[PDB]
Amino acid sequence: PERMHYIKGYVPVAYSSPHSSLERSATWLGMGFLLTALAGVGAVLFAVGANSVGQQQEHWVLYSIIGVVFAVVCTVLGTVLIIKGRAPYNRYVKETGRTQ
Amino acid sequence: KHFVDPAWPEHNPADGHVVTELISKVAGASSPWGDDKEFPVSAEETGYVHPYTRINR
Amino acid sequence: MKSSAKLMYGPTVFMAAMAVIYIFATMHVSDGGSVKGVEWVGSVALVLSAGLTLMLGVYLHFTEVRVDVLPEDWEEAEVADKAGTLGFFSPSSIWPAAMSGAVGFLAFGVVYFHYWMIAVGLMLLIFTITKLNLQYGVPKEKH
Amino acid sequence: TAVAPRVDGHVAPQRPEPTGHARKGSKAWLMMTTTDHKQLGIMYIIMSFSFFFLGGLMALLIRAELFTPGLQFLSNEQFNQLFTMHGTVMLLLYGTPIVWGFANYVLPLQIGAPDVAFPRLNAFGFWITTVGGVAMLTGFLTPGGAADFGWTMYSPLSDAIHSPGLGSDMWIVGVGATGIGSVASAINMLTTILCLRAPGMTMFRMPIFTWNIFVVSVLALLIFPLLLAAALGVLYDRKLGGHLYDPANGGSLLWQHLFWFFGHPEVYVLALPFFGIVSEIIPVFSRKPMFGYVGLIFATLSIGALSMAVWAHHMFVTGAVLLPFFSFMTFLISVPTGVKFFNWVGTMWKGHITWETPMIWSVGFMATFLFGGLTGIMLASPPLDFHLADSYFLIAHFHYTLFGTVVFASCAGVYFWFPKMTGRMMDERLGKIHFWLTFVGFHGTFLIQHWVGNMGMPRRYADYLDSDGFTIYNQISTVFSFLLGLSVIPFIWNVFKSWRYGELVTVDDPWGYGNSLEWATSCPPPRHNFASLPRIRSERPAFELHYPHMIERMRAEAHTGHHDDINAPELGTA
Amino acid sequence: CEVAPPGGVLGDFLRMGWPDGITPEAVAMGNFWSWVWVAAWIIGIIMWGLFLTAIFAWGAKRAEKRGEGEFPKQLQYNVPLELVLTIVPIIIVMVLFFFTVQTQDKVTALDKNPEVTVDVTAYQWNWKFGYSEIDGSLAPGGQDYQGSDPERQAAAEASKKDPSGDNPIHGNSKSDVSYLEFNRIETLGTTDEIPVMVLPVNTPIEFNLASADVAHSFWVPEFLFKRDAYAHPEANKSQRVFQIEEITEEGAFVGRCAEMCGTYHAMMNFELRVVDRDSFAEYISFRDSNPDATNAQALEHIGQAPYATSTSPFVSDRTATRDGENTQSNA
Amino acid sequence: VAALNRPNMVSVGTIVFLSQELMFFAGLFAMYFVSRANGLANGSWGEQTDHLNVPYALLITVILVSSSVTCQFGVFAAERGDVYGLRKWFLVTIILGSIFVIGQGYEYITLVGHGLTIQSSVYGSAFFITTGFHALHVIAGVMAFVVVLMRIHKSKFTPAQATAAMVVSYYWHFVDVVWIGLFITIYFIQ
Ligand code: HAS
Ligand code: HAS
Ligand SMILES: [Ca+2]
Ligand SMILES: [Cu+2]
Ligand SMILES: [Mn+2]
């Protein structure tokens, strides 16, 4: 423990190493929000589709705007959080020069 | 000071602890007879008495 | 237990977000072919499902900040690391079958709703559970 | 890495004797007091298939009655009870128990543990599930017969007013006893994976099967107690004077929402483990590792996460649910299933496929579930569901998905792990006969029911007029249904013969290229599953154990355009 | 959809057994179904092809005869292709959901301005139809016809409470029937006669569903639509009203129950008979003028079949039906 | 060196079980709130809910949280290896739990005394199912404490018995939490 040791010519499977991104909570939370973001895409599609046949005439702008707002906040949150969770991996790749 | 059952294993709290609600020194469940034991033991130390017995023919 | 403590955060946040989205949606969208108004069944289920996954995740994380670098989680561990006692495991026991039968008797009792069957079922059930829990601690025969 | 000195006069351990040599009385009391995960899993599997045959007999009776117009030998009441009990036993007494049986046998071998976390709890789960099964089936001994309200048990039809007779009650208890049996099985599988993994087996070196079982464990723990609460509420309304499910309280839609919140995760609980079983079978017989491993893990977790939001697409014709939201979510849940399909065909891409029996079963499962899910997408859109809902189109859809994901893939799993479970290999010829019979009989039975569903025949219809115009299609369905019934004769004979006189297994992996850890140990395993643990270092312990010369290739060709990271300098010191 | 199917044998195959439909939204649903089936067939063949390729092209004996060796390339990860193949179904279901929303919303919208509204009652095990309101064009009186029966509906409103007092369900009696509409022009379905509702051509029509007993469903396969009928639909938060823009062609069409209600669920058929608009005025004036006359007598007054030609009543004997002649001779 | 600190397997098992039971109570919550949503249209809820006795509810709530406090003192005694402190505090917890059971029982007896039962109204059915299932859980918890006392009376007090006491404490704390939720729902948020 406390440090790894690889000889030249040896390539391991990278997962669950101390530098791995799967081992940290930011990444998984970002996956959750990234999945959530597609709901806003569905919402805006529902709004404009209902508009296409002359329905939802009294609220369709609000539904489209709130769908887009939720989508953009969720997707940017997921992307940023994922990148934060992957920062240790980038530092390790700078450190060692091995990708796996 | 508090009482301690003598079956309790000895340890130094200053560098660890014996068991908590969250963690323990075992992967599975602890021994009902004490993890500090070292089985097996001798025949006479077991306390068992095997019966010789015969029946009529 | 690091990875599994933290991978539970995706499902729980997704369920919570769906719960809030759904509550706002059903309380506002007056679409034809449906009736406006918050529905409590479904919303309660979503929030308490998020609750279940959050309970699991938070307990596992709260525990995992205590434990050491176990060899099963160390990516280059040797088979000699885990040498020792793994733990205590029940070799055999008749009591699972007995208490399954007791629960069956109780269930049949509430089927026909004969009160004596319910009472005898509950008594038999706690008896079998007690015998299960005292199996490896019954005193030696007192001479 | 350490290399040990040689041992003087070393001999490999005595691997256990195969099955069929057991003496008299060698399993009776062992069975009654068992707390071994693997013997217990075998009896799980046998009991589940017993219930499978029992339910399928009722299915054949249904088909025989619908062969021609007019009630030839059943009444309306008997027909209703038949489809109710066929659905209930096939979903709850066959499917979920076979899932937990395969989990109990395989998962400790895959994660490199000796036993499950809670042995007596596992035995309790088995016995309580069988108790629930017998309670559920006891309704037929009633003079008035068993429950008659469909496997969903919609209200107010299940009210005390509208469903008297004790069979209606026995269903409620038989289901509940089954549900807690499932929960007791799940408590183990989470705690086991969390606490008894082998050294060096990090979480992302687990096989895909146990990942699916993990996700299914959390999903099942979410949803079985909700069923128990709803069912106890219904029994409370029935026996006492309760009013919670009264229609004037909104009880009908309350029950529908609560039940289907339970029920759609149940079908995903049946779905994921058999996806995992084929995800283990396909890499072995194509001699290629699993394609997109962590991608498949993310897809499985995505299915688990989406299953909880999809539930109300079973109610598009109720006029109560919000259509666009649930239609969008049940479209989203198609994506990871398609990812899994793409990964399967990808790992098969330019492989060396050998066609032993489990590979035949796996490709058959893929071919069937493709059309099943393709039909499910059509059912997902409300405007098509307004016509399709609760017709024979729905029947054909869910029989495609269930008969594909459960029956085909469970048979694949049986053929795959019969060596590891018995120390003997199944008859190949009988296996192929069984497969072709089941395949042709199935597609004959259920492909034509799409047309009767479209033409206007509703589900659960016991009799129909000669002038309606769909008698010939039912006749074609019935003949191939009897063929489906005949198909299981070679399966039963093959299992019976192979158990007691089958080909003995010598090597640890008769298929040759087993990737997962259970193929490194003996056939059968010893009582505690492992006479020695390999050096676990990837998702293929057994493969890299048995083929060292392949390792330099296996680590190098893994990624398209693989980086130069093999040439990177040394990173530390011992 | 606004775009028609391919037609011909391709359309018949893509249909694939759907009725042609007799309303505008039925046409819309059929078109959407046909194009969705086209896309589904594309996916089905383009993956069955890959499985067949595995069966015939990627076999082990071929590659070993070719000298490929004991093992293949051992590829595991192709991340860009994986992301592309993940993005493809996302876009497919997205663009599908757009048209789904379109067709669904034009189906379900309750703004079709009914000329006729018929209250429908489902009960174990038959249908009862009642004309609720009729526009002045078709009504006998020139002014709009309103069919609610005062005395019989007053009984329904009086049933809500106080049968000397039980009132358990939110202060109302457990046997409340105030949600049912009782009309003076009614057609009552029996085991001896299949009920027939008479409707005109080319008028927006409305259906108002409810259920005396357990939940039922109203399914007309020629509408390509079905809706659940519940007891206390307001209490269930279920939408009990649905409108058809019109019916486009005359004829007799069977309609069934599509919800498991009980023992005689299969016997609960009805017929929907669509008649010339000028004849509907005669029908309603005849039923109004001499209410003692039966539905069959009114249908004779039109000059069409007195009984449901689409489906005849089932034989009600549990032994006579064994030889397959389970059909009653209405006349 | 001493061994690693590994997760307590039985604690993970019981926590997973309590997380499962939370979804059991989710169903009763959903049924109650659907009943309340229906009732608030007619205002009949606002009448039936006036039958209840909130200060008595507060008293039994105080008793149950006192039970929780005593239970956790017993747990501290257990982790110290002191069997007698465990016996003390667990017997006190058993007493308080029995008093809570009697409290709910007397509540039910008085309520049927002055015109609220399962047949009286939808409020009656919802109230009694929601509180009675929790009452059965409290009874099972008292039984669990008594079984723990049997265990530590018969067997020598090893870590295997200490973790058993620790595990039953989790269940009792879950019982207290769900009572707090039920009380806030029924007597306060009403
Ligand atoms: C193991 C058991 C089951 C599985 C698996 C299953 C899968 C699905 N089902 Fe289902 N099903 C429904 C929808 C789906 C969907 C969307 C999926 C998904 O798993 C399907 C995804 C699977 C695939 C294999 C996807 C295709 C694969 C690929 C690679 C392409 C990706 C997808 C693309 C590109 C989009 C397609 C593209 C197009 C152009 C169409 C719906 C409603 O949306 C209902 C209720 C209808 C009603 O009115 O009652 C329903 C009804 C049932 C019932 C009713 C029982 C009863 O009523 O009593 C059961 C037991 C059942 C079982 C099962 N079902 N299903
Ligand atoms: C896992 C889930 C399921 C499987 C597998 C399954 C298999 C079949 N099904 Fe099905 N089912 C239908 C036809 C079949 C047929 C012909 C088979 C076949 O797999 C059956 C053949 C297989 C067999 C296996 C039976 C052969 C038995 C033999 C040859 C010998 C028996 C004698 C002995 C002694 C057995 C040996 C015993 C030993 C212990 C060794 C039909 C229509 O043809 C309906 C709708 C009908 C309606 O109107 O509602 C239906 C309804 C349902 C429903 C909805 C129920 C409801 O709406 O309430 C569900 C959930 C379901 C699930 C499942 N079903 N099925
Ligand atoms: Ca027939
Ligand atoms: Cu579903
Ligand atoms: Mn319906």
CATH number of domain containing E167: 2.60.40.420
Number of C-beta neighbours around residue D411 at 10 A: 24
Helix (H) or strand (E) holding D253: helix D251-286
How many angstroms separate the first and last alpha carbons of chain A?
A: 19
The Cα D494–Cα D485 span in angstroms is: 16
Which letter, b or e, does each residue of A3-40 get, where b requires 16 or more Cβ atoms within 10 Å of its Cβ? eeebeeeebebbbbbbebbbbbbbbbbbbbbbbbbbbb
State the maximum Cα–Cα separation within chain F, in Å, rounded to a whole number: 71
Residues 6+ apart with CB under 8 A from C135: C90, C93, C95
The Cα D441–Cα D491 span in angstroms is: 15
Q: What Å distances lie between residue D58 and A59, C138, D83, D453, CA to CA?
A: 52, 48, 7, 21
The Cα D331–Cα D343 span in angstroms is: 20
- Which residues in chain C have their C atom more than 2.5 Å from the N of the next written residue, marking a break after them? none
User: Which 8-state DSSP code applies to residue D524?
Assistant: S
List the single best residue of C44, C72, C117, C128 to mutate versus D (max D Cβ within 10 A). C72
User: Which 8-state DSSP code applies to residue D381?
Assistant: S
Could you write out the three-class secondary structure of chain E? CCCCCCCHHHHHHHCCCCCCCCCHHHHHHHHHHHHHHHHHHHHHHHHHHHHHHHHHCCEHHHHHHCCCCCCCCCCCECHHHHHHHHHHHHHHHHHHHHHHHHHHHHHHCCCCCCCEEEEEEEECCEEEEEEEEECCCCCCCCCCEECECHHHHHHHHHCCCCCCCCCCECCECCCCCCCCCCECCEEECCCCCCCEEEEECCCCEEEEEEECCCCEEEEECCCCEEEEECCCCCCCCCCCEEEECCCCCCEEEEEECCCCCCCCHHHCCEEEEEECHHHHHHHHHHHHHCCCCCHHHHHHHHCCCCCCCCCCCECCCCCHHHHCCCECCCC
* Residue D38: CA count within 13 A, CB half-sphere: 22
Number of C-beta neighbours around residue D574 at 10 A: 6
Q: Which residues of D touch F21 (CB under 8 A)?
A: 225
List the single best residue of E237, E241, E243 to mutate versus C (max C Cβ within 10 A). E237
Q: Is the same domain home to E241 and E267?
A: yes
Provide the residue range defining the domain that includes E24: 8-108
Q: Which residue, among E216, E107, E89, has the nearest Cα to D385 in the 3D structure?
A: E107
Interface check for C35 against chain D (CB to CB < 8 A): the answer is yes
Q: Which residue, among D192, A37, A56, F152, has the nearest Cα to E90 in the 3D structure?
A: A37
Ligand found nearest the CA of D387: 1
SS3 of residue F106 by DSSP: helix
Residues 6+ apart with CB under 8 A from C87: B26, B27, B28, B29, B30, F9
CA of F161 to the centre of ligand 2 (A): 49
Q: Which residue, among E249, F148, A35, E4, has the nearest Cα to D309 in the 3D structure?
A: A35
Is F38 part of any domain?
yes
Number of C-beta neighbours around residue C83 at 10 A: 10
CB nearest to B30's CB, from C63, C88, C137: C88
Delineate the domains of chain D, giving CATH numbers in brackets: 27-567 (1.20.210.10)
| Residue nearest (by alpha carbon) to ligand 2 atom 58 | D150
Number of C-beta neighbours around residue D345 at 10 A: 16
Count of domains observed in chain E: 2
Provide the residue range defining the domain that includes F119: 9-188
Is E324 part of any domain?
no
Interface check for E96 against chain D (CB to CB < 8 A): the answer is yes
CA of D354 to the centre of ligand 5 (A): 47
Is F105 part of any domain?
yes
Is E144 part of any domain?
yes
Pairing of strands E216-220, E225-229: antiparallel
Sequence-distant contacts of A57-66: CB under 8 A, at least 24 apart:
A59/C28, A59/C29, A63/C29
Q: Is the same domain home to E99 and E120?
A: no
E97 contacts A45? CB cut-off 8 A: yes
F10: burial class by Cβ within 10 Å (0-12, 13-18, 19+)? buried
D35 contacts C92? CB cut-off 8 A: yes
Site of tokens 């598009």: D316
The Cα D223–Cα F24 span in angstroms is: 9
Is F3 part of any domain?
no
E305 within 8 A of D443, measured Cβ to Cβ: no
Q: Which residues of E sit in the known binding site for Cu cation?
A: 216, 257, 259, 261, 265, 268
Q: What Å distances lie between residue D286 and C142, D161, D347, F48, CA to CA?
A: 64, 59, 8, 68
Report the DSSP beta bridge partners of residue E219: E226, E256
CA of D58 to the centre of ligand 2 (A): 6
F53 within 8 A of F131, measured Cβ to Cβ: no
Peptide bond into D199 cis (omega under 30): no
Ligand found nearest the CA of D299: 1
| Residue nearest (by alpha carbon) to ligand 1 atom 56 | D152
**DSSP 3-state percent helix, strand, coil across chain B (nearest 5):** 10, 5, 80
Q: Which residue, among D273, D153, D136, has the nearest Cα to D209 in the 3D structure?
A: D273
The Cα D522–Cα D419 span in angstroms is: 10
User: Which 8-state DSSP code applies to residue D155?
Assistant: T
Number of C-beta neighbours around residue D9 at 10 A: 5
For the record, the structure tokens of D41 come out as 């899993």
Q: What Å distances lie between residue E185 and D313, E136, E285, CA to CA?
A: 38, 16, 11
- The angle at the Cα of D295, spanning D290 to D301, to the nearest 5 degrees, equals 115
CB nearest to B34's CB, from F10, F158, F163: F158
Interface check for B7 against chain F (CB to CB < 8 A): the answer is yes
F151 within 8 A of C134, measured Cβ to Cβ: yes
Q: Which residue, among E203, E165, E192, has the nearest Cα to E281 in the 3D structure?
A: E203
D256 within 8 A of F34, measured Cβ to Cβ: no
The Cα F83–Cα B2 span in angstroms is: 10
Helix (H) or strand (E) holding D255: helix D251-286
- The angle at the Cα of B42, spanning B37 to B43, to the nearest 5 degrees, equals 130
Q: Is the same domain home to E127 and E144?
A: yes
Residue D535 CA to chain centroid, in angstroms?
31
The Cα D166–Cα D173 span in angstroms is: 11
Is ligand 1 within 6 A of the CB of residue D271?
A: yes
A41 contacts E98? CB cut-off 8 A: no
The Cα E187–Cα E120 span in angstroms is: 10
Partners of chain A (3+ Cβ pairs below 8 A): C, D, E
CB nearest to B32's CB, from C62, C66, C136: C136
For the record, the structure tokens of D114 come out as 């000796």
Helix (H) or strand (E) holding D432: helix D428-447
Q: Is the same domain home to E147 and E287?
A: yes
The Cα E273–Cα E270 span in angstroms is: 10
Q: Which residue, among D442, D105, D102, has the nearest Cα to D275 in the 3D structure?
A: D102
Site of tokens 């001499």: E290
CA distance C111 to chain A (A): 44
F71 within 8 A of F169, measured Cβ to Cβ: yes
The Cα D283–Cα D404 span in angstroms is: 19
For the record, the structure tokens of B3 come out as 């009482």
The Cα D204–Cα D21 span in angstroms is: 39
Q: Is the same domain home to E192 and E292?
A: yes
CA of E274 to the centre of ligand 1 (A): 36
Length of chain B counted residue by residue: 57
Q: Which residues of F touch D242 (CB under 8 A)?
A: 118, 125, 129
- Ligand 2 pocket, mutate which of D399, D461, D477 (most atoms under 8 A from CB): D399
Helix (H) or strand (E) holding F153: helix F122-154
Is F49 part of any domain?
yes
User: Which 8-state DSSP code applies to residue D353?
Assistant: B
Chain C residues with CB-CB distance to F under 8 A? Answer: 1, 38-42, 44-45, 48-49, 51-53, 55-56, 59-60, 63-64, 66-70, 84, 87-88, 126, 129-130, 133-134, 137-139
Atom of ligand 1 nearest to the CA of E42: 39
Q: Is the same domain home to E161 and E27?
A: no
Residues 33-62, chain A, touching E (beta carbon < 8 A): 38, 41-42, 45-46, 48-50, 52-53, 55-56
CA of E318 to the centre of ligand 3 (A): 12
E48 contacts D463? CB cut-off 8 A: no
Is E311 part of any domain?
no
The Cα D249–Cα D165 span in angstroms is: 24
Residues 6+ apart with CB under 8 A from D10: none
- The pocket around ligand 2, CB under 6 angstroms, is made up of D 50, 52-53, 56-57, 59-60, 62-63, 83-84, 86-87, 90-91, 94-95, 150-151, 395, 399, 402-403, 406-407, 445, 459-461, 481, 484-485, 488, 492
Last residue of a domain, one of E108, E130, E155: E108
Atom of ligand 2 nearest to the CA of D446: 43
Is F42 part of any domain?
yes
Q: Which residues of F touch B22 (CB under 8 A)?
A: 7-8, 11
CA dihedral F79, F84, F85, F86 (to 10 degrees): 60
Site of tokens 């149950």: F64
Atom of ligand 1 nearest to the CA of D339: 29
Helix (H) or strand (E) holding D425: strand D424-425
The Cα F39–Cα F19 span in angstroms is: 31
Count of domains observed in chain F: 1
E114 within 8 A of E206, measured Cβ to Cβ: yes
Is E225 part of any domain?
yes
φ, ψ for residue D191, nearest 5 deg: -60, -35
Q: Is the same domain home to E172 and E86?
A: no
F151 contacts C134? CB cut-off 8 A: yes
Site of tokens 């390999």: D534
Q: What Å distances lie between residue E66 and D20, D100, D349, D354, E262, CA to CA?
A: 43, 43, 17, 15, 65
Residues 6+ apart with CB under 8 A from E319: none
CA E137, E139, E140, E141 torsion: positive or negative? negative
Is E271 part of any domain?
yes
| Residue D264 assigned as binding residue | yes
Site of tokens 């997380």: F19
φ, ψ for residue E77, nearest 5 deg: -120, 130
Report the DSSP beta bridge partners of residue E207: E118, E242
The Cα D87–Cα D171 span in angstroms is: 12
Is F65 part of any domain?
yes
Q: What Å distances lie between residue D465 and D385, D475, E262, E313, E328, CA to CA?
A: 25, 14, 19, 9, 10
Which letter, b or e, does each residue of D129-147 get, where b requires 16 or more Cβ atoms within 10 Å of its Cβ? bbbbbebbbbbeebeebbb
CA of D265 to the centre of ligand 4 (A): 7
SS3 of residue B18 by DSSP: coil
Q: Is the same domain home to E217 and E80?
A: no
F149: burial class by Cβ within 10 Å (0-12, 13-18, 19+)? middle
Ligand found nearest the CA of D260: 4
D435 within 8 A of D368, measured Cβ to Cβ: no
Q: Is the same domain home to E132 and E206?
A: yes
How many angstroms separate the first and last alpha carbons of chain E?
A: 43
For the record, the structure tokens of D301 come out as 């977790």
Q: What Å distances lie between residue C95 and C119, C126, C139, D132, CA to CA?
A: 20, 12, 18, 17
Number of C-beta neighbours around residue B42 at 10 A: 6
Is F63 part of any domain?
yes
The amino acid at residue E51 is F
The Cα D425–Cα D506 span in angstroms is: 10
Site of tokens 């008659």: D148
Residues 6+ apart with CB under 8 A from D259: D152, D153, D227, D230
For the record, the structure tokens of C29 come out as 């969208």
Q: Is the same domain home to E122 and E226?
A: yes
The Cα D141–Cα D174 span in angstroms is: 14
Is F169 part of any domain?
yes
Partners of chain E (3+ Cβ pairs below 8 A): A, C, D, F
User: Which 8-state DSSP code applies to residue D96?
Assistant: H
CA distance B51 to chain F (A): 28
C34 within 8 A of D321, measured Cβ to Cβ: yes
For the record, the structure tokens of D175 come out as 């289901």
The Cα D152–Cα E314 span in angstroms is: 27
CA of D456 to the centre of ligand 3 (A): 18
The amino acid at residue E160 is K
The Cα E208–Cα E243 span in angstroms is: 9
Is ligand 1 within 6 A of the CB of residue D183?
A: no
SS3 of residue D400 by DSSP: helix
φ, ψ for residue D140, nearest 5 deg: -65, -25
CA of E190 to the centre of ligand 3 (A): 23
